[PDB]
Amino acid sequence: EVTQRELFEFVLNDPLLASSLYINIALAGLSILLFVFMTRGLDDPRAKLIAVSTILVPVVSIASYTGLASGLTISVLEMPAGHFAEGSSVMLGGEEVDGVVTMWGRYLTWALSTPMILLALGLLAGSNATKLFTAITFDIAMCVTGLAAALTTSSHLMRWFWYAISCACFIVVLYILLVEWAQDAKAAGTADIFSTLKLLTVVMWLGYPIVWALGVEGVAVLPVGYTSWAYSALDIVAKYIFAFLLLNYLTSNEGVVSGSI
Amino acid sequence: EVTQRELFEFVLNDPLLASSLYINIALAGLSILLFVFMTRGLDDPRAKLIAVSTILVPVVSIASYTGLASGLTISVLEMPAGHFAEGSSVMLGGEEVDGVVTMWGRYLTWALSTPMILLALGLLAGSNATKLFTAITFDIAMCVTGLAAALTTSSHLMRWFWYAISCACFIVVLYILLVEWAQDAKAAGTADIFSTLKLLTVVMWLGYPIVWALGVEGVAVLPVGYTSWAYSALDIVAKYIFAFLLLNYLTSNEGVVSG
Amino acid sequence: VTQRELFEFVLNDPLLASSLYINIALAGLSILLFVFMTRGLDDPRAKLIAVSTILVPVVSIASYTGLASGLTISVLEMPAGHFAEGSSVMLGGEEVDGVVTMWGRYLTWALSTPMILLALGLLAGSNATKLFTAITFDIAMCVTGLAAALTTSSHLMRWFWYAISCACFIVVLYILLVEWAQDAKAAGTADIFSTLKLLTVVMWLGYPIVWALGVEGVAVLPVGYTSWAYSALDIVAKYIFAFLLLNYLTSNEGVVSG
Numbered sequence A: 001e002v003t004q005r006e007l008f009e010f011v012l013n014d015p016l017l018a019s020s021l022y023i024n025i026a027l028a029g030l031s032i033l034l035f036v037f038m039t040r041g042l043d044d045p046r047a048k049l050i051a052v053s054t055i056l057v058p059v060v061s062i063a064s065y066t067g068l069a070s071g072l073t074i075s076v077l078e079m080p081a082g083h084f085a086e087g088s089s090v091m092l093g094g095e096e097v098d099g100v101v102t103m104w105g106r107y108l109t110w111a112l113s114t115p116m117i118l119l120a121l122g123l124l125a126g127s128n129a130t131k132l133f134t135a136i137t138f139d140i141a142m143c144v145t146g147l148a149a150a151l152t153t154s155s156h157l158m159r160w161f162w163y164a165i166s167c168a169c170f171i172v173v174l175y176i177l178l179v180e181w182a183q184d185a186k187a188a189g190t191a192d193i194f195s196t197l198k199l200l201t202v203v204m205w206l207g208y209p210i211v212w213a214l215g216v217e218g219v220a221v222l223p224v225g226y227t228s229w230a231y232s233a234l235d236i237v238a239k240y241i242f243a244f245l246l247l248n249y250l251t252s253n254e255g256v257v258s259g260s261i
Numbered sequence B: 001e002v003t004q005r006e007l008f009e010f011v012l013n014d015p016l017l018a019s020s021l022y023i024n025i026a027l028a029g030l031s032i033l034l035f036v037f038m039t040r041g042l043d044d045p046r047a048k049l050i051a052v053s054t055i056l057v058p059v060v061s062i063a064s065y066t067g068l069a070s071g072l073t074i075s076v077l078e079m080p081a082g083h084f085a086e087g088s089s090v091m092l093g094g095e096e097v098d099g100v101v102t103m104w105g106r107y108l109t110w111a112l113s114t115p116m117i118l119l120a121l122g123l124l125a126g127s128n129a130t131k132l133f134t135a136i137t138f139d140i141a142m143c144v145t146g147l148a149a150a151l152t153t154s155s156h157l158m159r160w161f162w163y164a165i166s167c168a169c170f171i172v173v174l175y176i177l178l179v180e181w182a183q184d185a186k187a188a189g190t191a192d193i194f195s196t197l198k199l200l201t202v203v204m205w206l207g208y209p210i211v212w213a214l215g216v217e218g219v220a221v222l223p224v225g226y227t228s229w230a231y232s233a234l235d236i237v238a239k240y241i242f243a244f245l246l247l248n249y250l251t252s253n254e255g256v257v258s259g
Numbered sequence C: 001v002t003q004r005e006l007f008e009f010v011l012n013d014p015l016l017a018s019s020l021y022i023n024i025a026l027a028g029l030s031i032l033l034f035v036f037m038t039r040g041l042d043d044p045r046a047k048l049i050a051v052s053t054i055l056v057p058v059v060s061i062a063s064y065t066g067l068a069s070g071l072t073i074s075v076l077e078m079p080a081g082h083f084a085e086g087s088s089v090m091l092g093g094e095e096v097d098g099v100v101t102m103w104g105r106y107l108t109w110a111l112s113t114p115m116i117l118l119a120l121g122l123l124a125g126s127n128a129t130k131l132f133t134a135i136t137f138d139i140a141m142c143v144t145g146l147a148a149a150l151t152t153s154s155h156l157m158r159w160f161w162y163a164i165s166c167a168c169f170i171v172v173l174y175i176l177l178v179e180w181a182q183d184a185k186a187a188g189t190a191d192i193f194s195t196l197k198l199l200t201v202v203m204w205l206g207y208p209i210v211w212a213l214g215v216e217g218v219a220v221l222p223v224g225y226t227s228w229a230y231s232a233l234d235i236v237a238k239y240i241f242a243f244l245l246l247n248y249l250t251s252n253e254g255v256v257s258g
């Protein structure tokens, strides 16, 4: 029976939690203003497809993070027997409440932002339509099963099963990035920039399943506030700096990526 | 602990509310029939695409309004401190429940129908895929953040912040409609009808955020029943008469949009 | 009612558990088999058809897990006049009014059918318009079905949603059986549609018939049988049907390539 306001106040009044959240609303807002400014000189429709898709990353981010900060996409959940976070309580409103303050809203940010990042990368890599579809479908699957795992409270073993499935989907995304697009970029004339962003993406994305396993949703070594900053830190690199680097290139090489959408 | 049934009964026994909802279900059904009939002569695959995108609007609208009228997509929400509708009470079942009956289902109508309208306008204007993608993504973000604000009860300020993000998204969609597509239509040879459809669209679309701000979701100068009829009036112009006007042109100019 | 209690309800109930854990297992094995069968495709258009088909059992293993875990199950009280009114079922160790409702099934369908449809549409040389029409109405079919299963305000609303969904059903079956059979002639794939013609009509029609008959509709079938009839179809539609599509595609890569 925890209200949204109660959760909104718990975030505020919790400097660790509030900061990892409000800082991204802020940074997402700046990225947007900056990116629109950087890209206002493009003309080719294909280059502009790469631009709006990249720019949509922080748009999704600022909206979703507002979802978290407002308490709209945060619920309190009790972990199943054997779960390392079973036995937690949090004090909400003015009483102790069993459960863990669960930021499931992060999965909405991901399910809606990762496909935009893959879209921009695939296009930059000159990918055909089959590889984009494969990458984006499995990536979405990865995010949805991740959310399903966080949301599962009936069985501790069930949680880790969703997690495994999500990992399998993640492998498909990684194979496309590391094996297929790495080569398609040579044919597209963007071998080096793609390779840079390919590494950045792979290194950063691998951080998420580790944080999940280590954070409150998993082994619980990282309490709620900390698992949150871990995710917020990854987001800043995987979303904002990534986009900046991608747009920095596109904004100086419009002609290399230009052509039929 | 309000049930779907009590909401279903609350809509009934409420003049303005039931009528503004049940009227749209009826006009949507009659619209679908009239539109199918109007477009039975189409043969060009591209004109048909425009025809079906358009028809999907009243389809979305009848299914969604049935969602509201049935209570499935309605909820009772307590507004935050400072909100003009906080402190409100509503008679549901056998008590005086705290809150405001929230027609959150409306945003499901706008999120699913507006992308179809936009798909209809962009194809008609000869728009390339980049602008359709832009117009449609920011349109979806617009409707979903609008839904987020309506669903926010934690803080009054947050409600107006979501409202702000939703309006910014609205501005992008508008720019494409009035500055980009308006110009693309010339190449497409559909400049005249696009103006008409563009004009009606922008003015009607502007009505929604205005209604939001003045109704129970905003400063509540308009009561629940009244905001509902305001949204219903608008849906009638932007969903049915607008769709009719588009199909009327299309069915008399198939060759122009050929593809 | 609790998620664990819904989860224990399915487990411990042989009929329910087997209709769910069998799909998870068969989907898991189907994904592996499908990926293996398609390891040789070289053409991009063919690859699109294959991954679009492979996603079918991917969606299935996730959604069924969604049901088996209790996440996508709920307990709803049917409205006055509904044949399942007055039902109770024992969940927290006590008597609970209502019917355990597997609404997760509509998620399974809303997410997997667009996928088999795009695979069949492409296979049929369909243009973009018929593909859009098929998928949009198909998704409208599943969403309105879910709405019907979720409506408790009145028994009448439920059937009205059902009619809306059935209307969408025919728009879809039409293009599948008629339109694409024809388009497939130019594509050189009329045969796969001709051979699977009866399989298609029967399995697709089987869903609205199970609805009307099961606890969601007139309820001549209890919950456990309502689940197995849906799960019997899913096995046909999601695994055997996808296999046949893939067996064909793999032997006819060249032609589907164009």
Ligand SMILES: CCCCCCCCCO[C@@H]1O[C@H](CO)[C@@H](O)[C@H](O)[C@H]1O
Pocket: A008, A009, A012, A025, B155, B157, B158, B161
């Ligand atoms: C850029 C996003 C803008 C949103 C900023 C949110 C910060 C405002 C928080 O408000 C305060 O919250 C307290 C706890 O509920 C109330 O006690 C107090 O009266 C209210 O004023």
Ligand SMILES: CCCCCCCCCO[C@@H]1O[C@H](CO)[C@@H](O)[C@H](O)[C@H]1O
Pocket: A081, A082, A083, A156, A157, A160
């Ligand atoms: C490589 C991924 C590693 C994930 C391994 C998941 C193992 C977690 C098992 O959970 C435990 O299962 C028992 C039997 O069901 C329950 O009795 C117990 O309460 C529950 O805590």
Ligand SMILES: CCCCCCCCCO[C@@H]1O[C@H](CO)[C@@H](O)[C@H](O)[C@H]1O
Pocket: A155, A157, A158, C007, C008, C011
């Ligand atoms: C052969 C692998 C298939 C795995 C299927 C997942 C089901 C896991 C069931 O675990 C059991 O759930 C009970 C609650 O219902 C707990 O009370 C019990 O302690 C726990 O051990």
Ligand SMILES: *C/C=C(C)/C=C/C=C(C)/C=C/C1=C(C)CCCC1(C)C
Pocket: A109, A110, A113, A114, A142, A143, A145, A146, A147, A149, A162, A163, A166, A167, A170, A205, A206, A208, A209, A212, A235, A238, A239
């Ligand atoms: C902008 C956000 C980004 C780049 C998010 C990426 C998220 C992932 C790669 C998440 C992956 C996960 C798994 C592979 C296992 C299950 C848990 C998840 C969801 C954290």
Ligand SMILES: *C\C=C(C)/C=C/C=C(C)/C=C/C1=C(C)CCCC1(C)C
Pocket: B109, B110, B113, B114, B142, B143, B145, B146, B147, B163, B166, B167, B170, B204, B205, B206, B208, B209, B212, B235, B238, B239
């Ligand atoms: C169903 C048809 C139409 C044309 C719907 C249009 C809806 C909008 C233009 C909604 C806009 C909103 C904004 C910009 C701000 C917050 C609240 C709204 C969701 C109402």
Ligand SMILES: *C\C=C(C)/C=C/C=C(C)/C=C/C1=C(C)CCCC1(C)C
Pocket: C106, C108, C109, C112, C113, C141, C142, C144, C145, C146, C148, C162, C165, C166, C169, C203, C204, C205, C207, C208, C211, C234, C237, C238
């Ligand atoms: C998973 C594969 C297939 C082919 C699923 C098909 C599903 C349907 C044909 C569902 C149809 C329904 C109708 C027409 C009426 C209301 C309820 C349903 C959603 C069951």
